[PDB]
């Protein structure tokens, strides 16, 4: 039930302390058009909260070349925080340093 | 004040399109004839579908829409029928509609192409264009899927729905060379010659003609298979003539009553 709950509501934590957890980590897949499903499956998310008057975390840094799409961002209040992988960007899965 | 004297000269006549030139007529008349070619030419087309059973991957409304767009050979029956909304009968009758039937089931292993060969008709002269070249595909069925429906085709014209449009494309054109300067080219030499340009390859556009009206309106009426391409023109002229006659009768009634 703990898995099934955190994956259903999106709150990353326990149900007794849900208001203290993260939110929106697990979202309903967007089956509206294939290009929306694919883009929802390769979506990044900077956890910086909204109501933020700062601009540096929202700006397209030079170092996002080839990793993050420099054009696909929401135009609302999440502009620059929600991102998208470039086509040939691969995220390392990890290995033992031994 | 009185009537100008229009002429006609058919340059190409096939069973699929007609190219003719109208001379000595006003632009408004020659363009209204074009508009009547598209909208106000009656034609028989499926406009009512009762689906007995449908198991195809196409939706019930998809089948109805596709059946609506199949052209039916209306050449002499169309001038006999009564408009559906103006007929006295309850439901449908031969005077105001052509019955159609399509009962199909796929049992063979290979997929069934539900073309227009499967549209049965209660009359021999009004059918999908199959007389004399593949046929319009309505549905594709797998093993165990079916389509069974009754349909009626009503007398209509392209002003209500595009299914009653008897033309593929009407190519209306006048004054090929820019003699009247009705259009201004920023660079006249970048523009290809019209098909009817009585102009050598040296000059770009005809020298300006200050006093001159548009005549010699070049048409290319292409049928969709329903009406023969000359019957389209004949019936369009008849229909515009009849619109004007009816309006004149109503105007006389308005005048005598004032």
């Amino acid at each position: 039930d703990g898995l099934k709950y955190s994956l259903a509501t999106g709150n990353w934590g326990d149900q007794k302390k849900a208001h203290q957890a993260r939110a929106g980590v697990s979202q309903v897949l967007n089956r509206l058009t294939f290009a929306s499903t694919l883009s929802h499956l390769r979506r990044l998310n900077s956890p910086i909260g909204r109501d933020g008057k700062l601009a540096k975390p929202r700006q397209l840094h030079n170092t996002l070349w080839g990793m993050v799409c420099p054009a696909e961002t929401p135009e609302g209040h999440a502009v620059g925080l929600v991102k998208n992988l470039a086509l040939m960007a691969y995220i390392s899965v990890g290995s033992q340093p031994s | 004040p009185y009537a100008n004297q229009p002429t006609v000269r058919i340059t190409e006549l096939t069973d699929e399109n007609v190219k003719f030139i109208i001379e000595n007529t006003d632009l408004a008349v020659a363009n209204s004839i074009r508009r009547v070619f598209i909208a106000e030419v009656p034609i028989i087309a499926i406009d009512w579908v009762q689906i007995d059973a449908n198991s195809s991957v196409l939706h019930d409304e998809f089948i109805a829409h596709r059946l609506g767009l199949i052209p039916l050979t209306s050449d002499d029956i169309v001038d006999k029928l009564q408009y559906s909304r103006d007929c006295t009968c309850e439901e449908f009758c031969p005077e105001c509609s052509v019955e159609f039937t399509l009962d199909v089931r796929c049992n063979e292993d290979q997929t069934r192409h539900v073309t227009s060969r499967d549209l049965i008709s209660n009359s021999p002269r009004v059918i999908p264009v199959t007389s004399r070249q593949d046929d319009i595909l309505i549905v594709k069925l797998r093993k165990g899927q079916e389509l069974r429906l009754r349909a009626y085709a009503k007398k209509g014209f392209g002003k209500e729905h595009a299914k009653w449009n008897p033309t593929a494309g009407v190519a209306f054109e006048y004054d090929p060379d820019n003699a009247l300067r009705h259009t201004v080219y920023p660079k006249p030499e970048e523009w290809p010659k019209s098909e009817y340009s009585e102009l050598d390859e040296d000059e770009s556009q005809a020298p300006y003609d200050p006093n001159g009206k548009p005549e010699r309106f070049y048409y290319n009426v292409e049928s969709c298979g329903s009406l023969r391409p000359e019957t389209i023109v004949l019936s369009a002229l008849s229909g515009l003539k009849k619109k004007l006659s009816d309006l004149q009768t109503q105007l006389s009634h308005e005048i005598q009553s004032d």
Partner: protein, 378 residues
């Protein structure tokens, strides 16, 4: 077509086009997106011309005859889920046709439209406030059925009955609704040119070339100069060359082998103005319009923001329980908020009577008694 098995999916809010088309000018990297196998849009003959003033201020004119031929026609699927349950010792929820002879709480709906099982049948023309799932809860019994959302108006597509984890009867019903593109529907291009369908003309009324080629969509020229979507013009120019060549052009971003002049050189080999313009004839009078119109195939999309899913009106509808004001939202038959900024807008107007009406008389009028000397709220 958002997925090839969309007929098995009992999704909430699915949209699929009747005749989606592959883009005539594509990038080489949309092959790996699988976009030519599940495309979203139709190549349309766009004419970038200010015609008759409705193709105006981000709006677009559309060819009504093209729509009649299935242009951008789409079907809208909505799914309703319901589950029976054991409410308690005394009360049980079950699917049965609500019946005034034994059920209380019945309403003005036509309950004859759904079968004895308690579920509407596949292929039944439903409408707003029609009963979709005949649930009854025994207390004799209270009609707790589920009704089609007000002003949805579709035809039941398929009805599935099964069990859930708890072994209770559980049905997901979905209703299809064909959506012809009317005026007010939102259409966009592949370059950021969003626009609503301003008005629809028949083929006889649209402008036409030297042959009977009329636009499917007419878009305002004033959309280009400030937004500088020159890629829209280059696409509208190369789609013509792709439709004449008879094979699909390339629009990879940084090609260096596809510049405007080479496309124009190709386009002039098929008997067209090398820059894409054409001599249109006014659809109303048949006279040539003195400016040669830019025209060509352009891959236009149909966005999900259809007007009939946004038109909303109210006149003394339901009311909230705590503060007896109109409900909120279109689905609840709520009323629009007369926010504070509107209050200030009316204050600046000096229209104190309209302000009073809006904030007191059309929202929540009430009366109380009060003492003339000491008592408060008697």
């Amino acid at each position: 077509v958002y997925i090839t098995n969309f007929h098995v999916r009992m999704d909430t809010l699915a949209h699929v086009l009747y005749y989606p088309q592959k883009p005539l000018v594509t990038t080489r990297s949309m092959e790996y997106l699988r976009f030519r196998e599940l495309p979203a849009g139709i190549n349309s003959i766009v004419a970038i011309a200010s015609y008759t003033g409705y193709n105006q201020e981000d709006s677009v004119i559309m060819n009504r005859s093209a729509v009649d031929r299935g242009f951008f026609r789409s079907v809208f699927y909505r799914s309703y889920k319901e589950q029976e349950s054991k409410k308690g010792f005394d009360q049980e929820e079950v699917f049965e046709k609500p019946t005034r002879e034994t059920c209380q709480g019945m309403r003005h709906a036509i309950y004859d439209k759904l079968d004895d099982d308690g579920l509407i049948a596949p292929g039944v023309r439903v409408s707003g406030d029609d009963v979709i799932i005949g649930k009854t809860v025994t207390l004799t019994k209270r009609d707790c059925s589920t009704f089609l959302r007000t002003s949805e108006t579709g035809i039941v597509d398929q009805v599935m009955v099964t069990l859930n984890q708890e072994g209770y009867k559980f049905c997901k019903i979905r209703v299809r609704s064909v959506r012809i593109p009317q005026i007010g529907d939102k259409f966009a291009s592949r370059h950021g040119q969003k626009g609503t369908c301003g008005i629809q003309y028949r083929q006889e009324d649209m402008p036409f070339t030297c042959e009977g080629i009329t636009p499917d969509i007419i878009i305002n020229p004033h959309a280009i100069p400030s937004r500088m979507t020159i890629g829209h013009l280059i696409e509208c120019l190369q789609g013509k060359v792709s439709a004449n060549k008879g094979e699909i052009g390339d629009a990879t971003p940084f090609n260096d082998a596809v510049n405007v002049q080479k496309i124009s050189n190709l386009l002039s080999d098929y008997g067209y103005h090398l820059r894409g313009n054409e001599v249109l004839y006014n659809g109303f009078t048949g006279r040539k319009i003195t400016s040669q119109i830019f025209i060509g195939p352009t891959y236009y999309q149909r966005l999900k923001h259809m007007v009939d899913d946004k038109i909303h009106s109210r006149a003394r509808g339901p009311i909230q329980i705590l503060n007896r004001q109109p409900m909120e939202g279109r689905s609840r038959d709520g009323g629009l908020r007369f926010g504070e900024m509107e209050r200030d807008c009316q204050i600046a107007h000096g229209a104190a009577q309209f302000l009073r009406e809006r904030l007191f008389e059309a929202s929540d009028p009430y009366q109380v008694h009060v003492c003339n000397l000491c008592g408060i709220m008697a």
